[PDB]
Amino acid sequence: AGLLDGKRILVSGIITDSSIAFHIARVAQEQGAQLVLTGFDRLRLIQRITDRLPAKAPLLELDVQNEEHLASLAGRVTEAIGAGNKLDGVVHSIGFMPQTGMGINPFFDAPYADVSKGIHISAYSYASMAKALLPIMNPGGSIVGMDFDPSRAMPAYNWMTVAKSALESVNRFVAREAGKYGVRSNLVAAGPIRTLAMSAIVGGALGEEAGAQIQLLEEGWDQRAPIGWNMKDATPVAKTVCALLSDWLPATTGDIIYADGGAHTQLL
Amino acid sequence: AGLLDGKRILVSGIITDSSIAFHIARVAQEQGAQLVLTGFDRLRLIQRITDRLPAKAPLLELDVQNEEHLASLAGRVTEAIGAGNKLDGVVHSIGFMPQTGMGINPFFDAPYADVSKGIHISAYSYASMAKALLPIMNPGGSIVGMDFDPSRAMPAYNWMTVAKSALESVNRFVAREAGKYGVRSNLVAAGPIRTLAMSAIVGGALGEEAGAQIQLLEEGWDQRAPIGWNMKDATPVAKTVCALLSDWLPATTGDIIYADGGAHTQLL
Amino acid sequence: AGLLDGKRILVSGIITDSSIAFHIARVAQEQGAQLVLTGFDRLRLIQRITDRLPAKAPLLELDVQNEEHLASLAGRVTEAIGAGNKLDGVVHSIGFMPQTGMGINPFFDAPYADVSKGIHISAYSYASMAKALLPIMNPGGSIVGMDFDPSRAMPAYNWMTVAKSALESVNRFVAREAGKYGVRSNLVAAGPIRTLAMSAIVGGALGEEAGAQIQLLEEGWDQRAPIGWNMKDATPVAKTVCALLSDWLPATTGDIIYADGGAHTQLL
Amino acid sequence: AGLLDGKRILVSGIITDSSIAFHIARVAQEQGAQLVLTGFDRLRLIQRITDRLPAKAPLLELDVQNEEHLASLAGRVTEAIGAGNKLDGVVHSIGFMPQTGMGINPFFDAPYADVSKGIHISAYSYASMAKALLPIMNPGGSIVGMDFDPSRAMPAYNWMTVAKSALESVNRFVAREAGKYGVRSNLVAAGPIRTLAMSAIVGGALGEEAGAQIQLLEEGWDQRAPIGWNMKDATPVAKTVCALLSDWLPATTGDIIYADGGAHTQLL
Ligand SMILES: NC(=O)c1ccc[n+]([C@@H]2O[C@H](COP(=O)([O-])OP(=O)(O)OC[C@H]3O[C@@H](n4cnc5c(N)ncnc54)[C@H](O)[C@@H]3O)[C@@H](O)[C@H]2O)c1
Ligand SMILES: NC(=O)c1ccc[n+]([C@@H]2O[C@H](COP(=O)([O-])OP(=O)(O)OC[C@H]3O[C@@H](n4cnc5c(N)ncnc54)[C@H](O)[C@@H]3O)[C@@H](O)[C@H]2O)c1
Ligand SMILES: NC(=O)c1ccc[n+]([C@@H]2O[C@H](COP(=O)([O-])OP(=O)(O)OC[C@H]3O[C@@H](n4cnc5c(N)ncnc54)[C@H](O)[C@@H]3O)[C@@H](O)[C@H]2O)c1
Ligand SMILES: NC(=O)c1ccc[n+]([C@@H]2O[C@H](COP(=O)([O-])OP(=O)(O)OC[C@H]3O[C@@H](n4cnc5c(N)ncnc54)[C@H](O)[C@@H]3O)[C@@H](O)[C@H]2O)c1
Ligand SMILES: Cc1cc(N)n(Cc2nnc(Nc3ccn(Cc4c(F)cccc4Cl)n3)s2)n1
Ligand SMILES: Cc1cc(N)n(Cc2nnc(Nc3ccn(Cc4c(F)cccc4Cl)n3)s2)n1
Ligand SMILES: Cc1cc(N)n(Cc2nnc(Nc3ccn(Cc4c(F)cccc4Cl)n3)s2)n1
Ligand SMILES: Cc1cc(N)n(Cc2nnc(Nc3ccn(Cc4c(F)cccc4Cl)n3)s2)n1
């Protein structure tokens, strides 16, 4: 049967059909999973997109910055999957950093209010989500988050790299808490993916240099990667999240699995 | 419709039914894989152990230190799986370090001839095996090897830790070579497993202190592991090797997946 | 004759004579450096403590959360060292995490407002300080910050570990900026030291079950440390900051130097 | 006075006036150290080179592969520095990998006899040297070895990268032993240095493709390094070894100090 056959999985972070979460949800559904989806702000738009998934799935509003949304989350999920049922998987595919903190603006010019908003959404919310959903998770369960290797500095990513460094630390502590429930907590450090936003930067939305920068990053990534890297294909990343959601990585927690073509293991 | 259905996989390193390779072979077979097994010396003695696996599998002699064994290996594998057939997976579960380099003997007292024998078997042979089998491997294939996290020094493991540090480097270069074939190369860094040598030291073979050191390591490993660690259970390790042998980790190469209960991510 | 002879160095973070910055200031002064000191809140207590240093040094108010304090900082430093003079070194020995995010309070119960305050002071302010002081720094100069190894999760440190993970990332980006000035940026990852909040008999934000855990950390640190760890001696840490402030580590930037007795390199 | 004033230091690995050890020996002597030098094979030539150092220093024969040379080493050093005197420092600047294991030959084609020779000289000998000299070292002493970051694979370096991975592991264990003597053990991970052999490759000794590979590595290194990288200047590397030989890094052992311009901390 499917790799996630009979598993109830919550998938957050679908905004467009280019979203890494859209591919995670598609592959999970193809693999037998029953999903609950969470969306933020543009809920009629998210619903129009989630309608294109292989199967029907409840859509729940979740702004990770809203305390009431988090407090009611477990209650709202239980109502959607049915009383007496628990989640076997949670996918955090949420990330945000204002333009002041990521892009063409100098590193020193990012106001802390902006950096703090980005760290809240990109790092702290991994713990928020785990706090809310662990009480309605089954033993053997899995929490997966999305990472972009922050171990070395790079142009443009700036405070998003700082936020991913914090996310990596948050994951290690979430694992400590999750373990009390028999639940694993891990990250998928993916190589660059051509989402709508990335296609817009490459296209010059923020100028020729920011575009050239992303194309240069992508070129070197495919070059270093012993098996190559196709930024236009999120399926290898989606498959890796599903591997972690499955029972096939049962002794891995507080960790990072690199779905990057093996680029991080090569210098040149 | 198991995880490795229709896959032809070579599994090296079975000596007892406690061997990590025995559990890898058992889980792979349970998951629909057609296996070729390689054994070191015994063969007749090894065959009686492989006979206890869920299904029949050809047993081939392979001493990684013997040049003729490696030269003839691909030819012998092809004969066993049938002309026109190729391997989809290779499992290197081979390791050895003489008592002089691993145990109660001081680190400075290990003669280089002994360290060299251990490095040959435990590290260099990962490249030797890849060299021999990559020409008879299919695109999308996977080479998996066994590691014991050498990133920090520890008592007793001494030169076996040094050998694993070399193994980790070898795997990153093997990935470069394997990529030319569409093949991934990765290591499963396992927590301590009660195999032949481990059960011997615990049992008192190198005295009361040495046995006590291993029991203390194991206690602390389970303590650190947010999901715990059972050194008497190789199934979580075997399942992880199968995840890497599958098509569910398609963008991971030259890497290390930690099947250690998440112990390496926790300080205390 | 001294290691920092003729060097003008700014030292932040003195509150008591137990403060790592007090020892950095003392060793730097012993080594020929001319200092400018920055203090926060209790500027009367700070002045009396700084009066105990081997030599006189101007004391300037600096709350890293106050925008005006940062905007006026370079101007105020220049006034103290004399027009036409620039800093050769900058020491960031600033850290803070509320009791909700560091201690016995559950990890999930730390409100983001508290975590954000801690990340602002402990991580973001390293960039804030570099932004303010780099325009008044000389080529060959050095920015040093204080880190506590966050690569593995641990009890009690909780969100302070998350903040140090962010600090490490901030340092790599600050190095990029500093390099444009011929200035190096590095962190000193110290072993635990009994400073104001760490205090067990007189003062301290550490009490009851948390105090028990920090005692287990202490003993563990010294056991792991091949050269031992004295939590009551900040001199080895102070000497390491001075090594980075000197011209003896001229090719090291965006890095971490561990003054921890070597504990981080040992498993057991 | 000098950074190594009154310190008795053994310096190995001088073969040409371009050798990293020649610069280490020159800077150490400039900084007040009294040295003992060890040379291999071409001792009349080594003497001619070492005659160009700022001060006279005894030259001792030491082939790290010769057991008698190691057994007699401490005795021979004591005779040179005078009875009752001990070394305060030891510099291991020894490295070798045959052309089959480093260069233009395929990674899989390196015979183990060649790899074993290279690992013996480049990694194992760090432990051999420490075994021999620790009994004649003073508390507070320092053992320093030379490294080239092997954490990521790269073209051409092949089995030398594998040997450096082993060296890094050896260092962590040597630290455990050294600590019993109050002696620190660390490695200096240097960026590429234009030694005679490097100038020969760049110049086309192993063909145009190999030259271009080295030139490309060096170009990328200077690019990533926030403070740049001059492969033609060994002084920043020599100064870093001296910082470790001094009393200014007293809490650092079993570690790696990167004298690489900060390159290893930057992706691009
Ligand atoms: N695209 C890449 O190259 C890449 C690489 C590695 C990791 N990632 C990470 O993958 C994740 C998904 O990003 P993506 O590339 O699919 O882009 P995306 O824009 O499709 O996804 C990010 C999601 O975060 C959601 N979000 C933002 N603020 C929120 C809030 N307050 N509450 C709830 N949801 C909120 C958005 O609605 C969106 O659905 C992010 O964590 C991102 O950092 C992306
Ligand atoms: N047991 C643990 O705690 C642990 C932890 C991490 C990694 N590992 C690694 O897992 C692997 C398997 O070891 P194990 O623990 O299952 O024990 P094991 O004793 O059952 O297996 C090691 C195997 O190596 C084989 N071997 C030795 N020399 C050989 C040679 N010259 N040619 C061919 N084969 C040779 C032996 O025949 C044996 O089957 C090793 O690489 C080991 O280092 C073990
Ligand atoms: N003590 C340890 O075990 C240890 C270990 C590793 C790193 N460190 C780090 O060393 C540094 C120095 O801390 P310490 O241990 O000497 O203790 P400390 O309490 O004496 O020093 C922390 C300093 O931060 C200052 N500070 C707090 N909020 C501030 C603000 N808003 N603006 C400006 N200054 C502010 C305080 O006034 C104080 O001087 C910190 O960054 C700490 O995280 C400490
Ligand atoms: N040049 C670089 O790009 C670079 C970068 C990082 C590290 N390193 C390392 O720095 C060290 C110094 O090498 P270098 O580049 O200055 O070149 P080098 O050739 O001048 O020095 C290497 C030394 O090893 C000695 N040696 C070889 N076999 C020996 C044996 N059996 N016994 C004793 N000595 C022996 C040689 O005589 C020579 O003095 C080596 O460890 C090298 O790996 C070099
Ligand atoms: C790790 C990662 C990668 C991506 N795309 N995400 C999701 C995002 N979350 N917040 C973002 N905000 C911003 C501010 C500016 N940009 C555009 C831009 C850039 F300037 C430089 C590089 C890439 C991009 Cl897309 N995106 S992007 N997370
Ligand atoms: C990482 C790992 C674990 C196991 N079982 N292997 C396979 C081996 N290959 N050669 C070995 N040789 C020897 C010599 C002595 N011992 C026993 C011992 C010890 F003294 C100290 C620590 C642990 C052990 Cl098991 N094992 S163990 N590799
Ligand atoms: C890495 C480090 C060490 C120290 N002293 N600092 C500076 C600080 N800044 N704010 C702090 N605030 C707090 C809240 C509670 N405590 C006490 C406590 C604990 F409960 C558990 C562990 C350690 C400690 Cl110290 N300190 S500590 N940074
Ligand atoms: C880490 C490091 C760098 C250097 N030069 N050393 C010292 C050496 N020890 N043995 C060496 N042997 C060999 C075999 C072939 N080459 C030439 C060559 C190459 F093919 C590829 C790259 C660089 C060079 Cl120089 N050097 S070089 N250690």
Numbering used by the authors:
A (entry chain H), B (entry chain B), C (entry chain D), D (entry chain F): 2 to 269
What does the paper say about this structure?
Isoniazid (INH), a successful frontline TB drug for more than 50 years, targets the NADH‐dependent 2‐trans enoyl–acyl carrier protein (ACP) reductase InhA. This is a key enzyme in the Mtb cell wall synthesis pathway and does not have a human orthologue. InhA inhibitors are known to modulate the tertiary structure of the InhA protein binding pocket, in particular the substrate binding loop (SBL). Herein we describe the screening of such a library, in comparison with other fragment sets, against the highly validated Mycobacterium tuberculosis (Mtb) target InhA.
